[PDB]
Amino acid sequence: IQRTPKIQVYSRHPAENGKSNFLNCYVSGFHPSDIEVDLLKNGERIEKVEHSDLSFSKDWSFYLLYYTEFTPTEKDEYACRVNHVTLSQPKIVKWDRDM
Amino acid sequence: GVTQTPRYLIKTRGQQVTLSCSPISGHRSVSWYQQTPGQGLQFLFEYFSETQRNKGNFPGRFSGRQFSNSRSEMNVSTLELGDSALYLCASSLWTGVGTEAFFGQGTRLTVVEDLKNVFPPEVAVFEPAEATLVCLATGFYPDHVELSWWVNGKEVHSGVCTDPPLKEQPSRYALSSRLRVSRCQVQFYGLSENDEWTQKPVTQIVSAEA
Amino acid sequence: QVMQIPQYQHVQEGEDFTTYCNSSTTLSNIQWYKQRPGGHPVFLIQLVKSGEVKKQKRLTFQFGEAKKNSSLHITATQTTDVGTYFCASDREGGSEKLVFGKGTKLTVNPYIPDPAVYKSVCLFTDFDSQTNDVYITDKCVLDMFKSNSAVAWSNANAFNNTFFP
Amino acid sequence: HSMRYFFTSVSRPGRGEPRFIAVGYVDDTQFVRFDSDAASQKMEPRAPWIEQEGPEYWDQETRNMKAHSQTDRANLGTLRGYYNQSEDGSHTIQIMYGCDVGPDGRFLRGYRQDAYDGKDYIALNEDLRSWTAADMAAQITKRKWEAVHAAEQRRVYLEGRCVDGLRRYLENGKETLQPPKTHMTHHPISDHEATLRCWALGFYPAEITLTWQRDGEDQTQDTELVETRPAGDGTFQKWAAVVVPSGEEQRYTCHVQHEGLPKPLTLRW
Amino acid sequence: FTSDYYQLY
C-alpha cells in the first residue's frame, strides 16, 4: 500500500544567527520508501544532504532524517522538497524558524 | 539427497585436488566438513550464494567456491599427510541457523606418501567344511574398499562383515568380509586416469568367483 | 561448544543408548546424525526448541524443555543401529555453522553360540557375544543373525591370544 | 530497554538487486546500519559505543545481513508469487524483530513482525510460540513457519542472542544508551488570537508526553501534536501548539512527561 | 547479535 508522508522540516535547536546548525527534514510516515528528498536553500538543491538510515515505525511507515550543516540567517530561506509515489507533485515545505 | 564427487580420490601430497558437491535441489547454502578421525567433523568453510559466509579454522590452502546453481567445489592445495580425511558437504536449504543441514555421501580423500604405495587388492574367495564365505581383500592401500558381495550380480547385505581394515605393517591395508548361505566383488576405487604411473593401480573392479 | 558426554558407548542389542548432549549457550536446534560406519552422517531429525520428545521410527529424540539441553534414545537397539551418533548446534552467534559433538560410537551385541575356528583361511565363527605374521580380523555380525565371525590367516589354532576341527 | 532491528527490502524491477537498507535500534538509538547499495557492503557502525566491538563481530554481522539480504530477495520472489504481482513493481518487505528487557537485563517480551508492501504481513505474538496473519499469503507463511516451528527458533533468538547482545550493548552504552529544554517560545498570530509553542529539545528516549493542561482541565482541541522528530544525534524533538486568544499567556501551560526528568517541569510564559 | 536464523516466506 501507498501512504503519503508527514514531512517535517526543522532544526536541532531554535534558529539563531551566526552559529552552526542542521536542517532536519524528518521525512516520515511514507511507504514505499522509494523516496527522493531534497533540502532547498532559496530553491536550490543541495548535495551535502547525507540522510539518516531508512527505518519504519510500528505502523510500517518509514521515516528518514535528511540533515545538512548550515548557518541560520534571516536573509536566505531554507526549505525541503520531497517526491513520493503518493505525491503527484513535489511538496516543498518551508523551514519555519518558529515552527 | 546430496550428490558429492569424487568418492575416494587418492591424490598424493602437494597436488590440487578438487572436490565437488551438488546440494539438494533448492538448497542455496553449502557447508564443507573434514572428518579426520582424530578431530571428528571439523568445519572447513560454508558457502551461501557464491560467497564464503562461514569459514572454519583451516589454513589458506583449504579453498572452495560455489557456482550459480548453488553447487560448490573445494580445493586443497599443498597436501600433507594429515589431510587423509573423509571430506563432507553439508547442504542447507538456507544459510544460518535453523536449517536442516543434510549431508553428502562424502569424499574419502587420502594423501598417500607416494603413488607407488597405492596397490590393488589381492582377492581370494574361500570355500564354505561348516557355510561362511570369506573374500580377503589383501594388500591394498588406502582403505577405499566398497566390498559388498555380489553373489549373483546383486547386493546381498544378508551377511557382510566389512571390517570397520587391518594394517599389514602398523602401511598397506587388508580387508575381510563374510557371507553365509544354506562369488565376491571388491571395489578398489584407486588411482584415476589423471594420476601418472612411474612403475598401474587404477580403479579396478576386481572380483573372485566361487 | 557442545559436550556429547558418552564419547563411546558400547551396549548390547537390548536397550539404553541415551546419548545426552550437554551444552551451554541455548541451542536453537540440535539435529541428529547417524554416521553409519564407513559412511556419511545421515540426517535423522532436527529438534527445534519445541521441547518435548520426537519418536522417529523406534528411536526416541529428546530436546530439553529448557535452555541448552538435548538427548537421544534408541530404546530397543539393534545391529543396524551401529554408528557414530553426532550432535549439532547452529547456535545463533557462532562463526562456525554447526558445532558437532565428538560423537558416540554405538556398538551392539547380538544375543545369539557354538564357537568354532575353521592359501587357506581360519575362521572363528558362531562364538559367544562376550567373546571379546598372523593377521586376525575384528569380530563382526551377520544380520541375516548367527553373527560373530572372525577370520585369521597367514602364509589351525590361529587365535592363540571353542571348537578346533 | 529494547533492541530493534528494522529491515527494508524495497525491490527494484530491473534496476539491480533489491535494496536492503537494514538498521539496528537498541532502545531509541540506531547503532548498526547495513546498506545494500553502500560502497563498503559492510556493517557501518552508527554509535560511538559500537565502534569498539571486535572485527570478528563486524564480520559476523555483515555476513549475517548479507544472508538476510539474499533472504529478502528470496522472500520477495515468494511473495510476488503469493500476491500474484508483476515483477515490474517495486515491492517492499519490511521486517522488524526485537526483544525487551527490564532494568535488571532480564528478557521481558520479544518482537518479530513482518510487513509486505505496507500491510502487516505476519508478526510474532507476545507468547513467542505462534504467529499472526493478515491474508492468505500470511496463511501460507503461517503454515510454513509452524511446520518447521520457526516460531520456536525465533523465540530462541529473541530470548537468547537478542538479549545477550542487548545487555552487552548496555555495558557498552551506560554513558549513552541510558531532559527536554522546554524553551516556551511565543509568536504573535493576531490581535485577537495567538499560539504558544513550548520548545522541548534533546530528550532521550522518544516516549515524551505533552498535554497542554490548564491547572485541571484537559485539552485536545486545537492542540495539534507533531510526530516524534529526531534531531539527528540519536535524541528526539517534540513540541505542541494551542490556538488561544491573545493576552492570556499566563493561563495556558504544557506539562512535560519524560523519563529523564526528575520532576515534570511547567512553564507559564 | 543479529538473527542468524532466516525463516523463509
Q: Over D168-197, what HEC string results?
A: HHHHHCCCCCCCCCCCCEEEECCCCCEEEE
User: Residues of D at the C interface (Cβ-Cβ below 8 Å)?
Assistant: 56, 59-60, 148-149, 152-153, 155-157, 160-161, 164
**Sign of torsion, CA D227 D232 D236 D241?**
negative
CA nearest D118: which of D86, D147, D89?
Answer: D89
Cα separation values, D242 from A14, A63, D210, D246, Å: 19, 26, 12, 11
Q: What are the b/e assignments for B138-156, b being 16+ CB within 10 Å?
A: bebbbbbbebbbeeeeeeb
CA nearest B199: which of B121, B115, B82, B111?
Answer: B115
d(CA B72, CA B89): 9
Q: What are the b/e assignments for A85-96, b being 16+ CB within 10 Å?
A: eeeeeeeebebe
Encode chain C in three state secondary structure.
CEEECCCEEECCCCCCCCCCEEECCCCCCCCEEEECCCCCEEEEECCCCCCCEECCCCCEEEECCCCCCEEEECCCCCHHHCEEEECCCCCCCCCCCCCCCCCEEEECCCCCCCCEECCCCEEEECCCCCCCCCEECCCECCCCCCCCEEEEECCCCCCCCCECC
- Between chains, do C142 and B161 touch, taking CB under 8 Å as contact? yes
Q: How far is C1 from chain E (nearest CA, A)?
A: 17
Residue B121 is given by DSSP the state P
Name beta bridge partners: A70: A21
Residue E8 is given by DSSP the state -
- Between chains, do D120 and A52 touch, taking CB under 8 Å as contact? no
CA nearest B103: which of D215, C40, D33, C142?
Answer: C40
H-only helix segments in chain D: 55-82, 136-147, 150-157, 163-172
Q: What are the b/e assignments for D8-41, b being 16+ CB within 10 Å?
A: bbbbeeeeeebbbbbbbbbbbbbbbbbbbeeeee
Resolution in A: 3.0
- Between chains, do D156 and C49 touch, taking CB under 8 Å as contact? yes
Name chain B contacts of C118, Cβ cutoff 8 Å. Answer: 129-130, 132
The residue in chain D having the minimum alpha-carbon distance to the alpha carbon of residue C96 is: D60
Name chain D contacts of C69, Cβ cutoff 8 Å. Answer: none
Cβ–Cβ under 8 Å, residues A53 and D30: yes
Q: Which amino acid is at A40?
A: L
The answer to whether C65 contacts chain D (CB < 8 Å) is: no
- Between chains, do A12 and D201 touch, taking CB under 8 Å as contact? yes
For residue B170, cis peptide bond before it (omega within 30 degrees of 0): no
Name chain B contacts of E2, Cβ cutoff 8 Å. Answer: none
d(CA C159, CA D22): 70
Name chain E contacts of C28, Cβ cutoff 8 Å. Answer: 4-5
Query: What SS3 state is found at D251?
Result: helix
The answer to whether E6 contacts chain C (CB < 8 Å) is: no
- Between chains, do B95 and D67 touch, taking CB under 8 Å as contact? yes
Closest CB to E8 among D75, D97, D121: D75
For residue B6, cis peptide bond before it (omega within 30 degrees of 0): yes
Beginning with the edge strand found earlier in the chain, give each strand of the sheet holding A93-94 in spatial order.
A36-41, A78-83, A93-94
- Where residue C68 falls (left for φ over 0; alpha for ψ -120 to 50; beta otherwise) is left
Task: Write out the residue range of the structural domain in which residue A51 sits.
Answer: 1-99
Q: How far is A98 from chain D (nearest CA, A)?
A: 7
User: Residues of C at the E interface (Cβ-Cβ below 8 Å)?
Assistant: 28, 90, 92-94
- Between chains, do E9 and D168 touch, taking CB under 8 Å as contact? no
The residue in chain B having the minimum alpha-carbon distance to the alpha carbon of residue C83 is: B164
CA nearest D77: which of D137, D29, D28?
Answer: D137
Residue D23 is given by DSSP the state E
d(CA A95, CA A76): 11
Query: Measured at the alpha carbon of residue B122, what is the angle toward residues B120 and B128, in degrees to the nearest 5?
Result: 145
H-only helix segments in A37-96: none
Phi, psi at residue B30, to the nearest 5°? -125, 130
- Between chains, do D67 and B48 touch, taking CB under 8 Å as contact? yes
Beginning with the edge strand found earlier in the chain, give each strand of the sheet holding B18-22 in spatial order.
B3-5, B18-22, B72-76, B62-66
d(CA C85, CA C42): 9
Residue A82, domain CATH: 2.60.40.10
Cβ–Cβ under 8 Å, residues C117 and C162: yes
Cα separation values, C102 from C36, C81, D51, Å: 15, 18, 37
- Between chains, do B96 and E6 touch, taking CB under 8 Å as contact? yes
d(CA D6, CA A58): 10
- Between chains, do D61 and E7 touch, taking CB under 8 Å as contact? no
Name beta bridge partners: D158: none
CA nearest C79: which of C137, C13, C30?
Answer: C13
Count: domains in chain A: 1
d(CA D14, CA A31): 20
Name chain C contacts of E4, Cβ cutoff 8 Å. Answer: 28, 90, 92-94
- Between chains, do E5 and B98 touch, taking CB under 8 Å as contact? yes
